Design a protein around this ligand. Sequence first.
Ligand SMILES: *[C@@H]1O[C@H](CO)[C@@H](O)[C@H](O)[C@H]1NC(C)=O
Lengths: 42, 34
Amino acid sequence: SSTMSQYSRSTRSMYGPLQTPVGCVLGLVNSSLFVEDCKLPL
Amino acid sequence: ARSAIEDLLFDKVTIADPGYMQGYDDCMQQLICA
Ligand SMILES: *[C@@H]1O[C@H](CO)[C@@H](O)[C@H](O)[C@H]1NC(C)=O
């Protein structure tokens, strides 16, 4: 949360950030699970 | 992995890579940078 712009961040559910191949994620849990039919693929 | 036919196809054609993994970092500390 150090160097942001626009309006501040909204976070409640305190939970370290996780490094994903697409980037760095917050609000997620590590889980080695496999689903074929993701309604909302990240 | 990538098939050799598509290996040739991918390498021969001019591809600029839009940084899937850390491409932002690849121009902060080192076109698809601007
Ligand atoms: C999940 O944990 C494994 C090892 O426990 C690690 O290699 C992987 O990077 C973690 N996933 C994320 C998104 O950080």
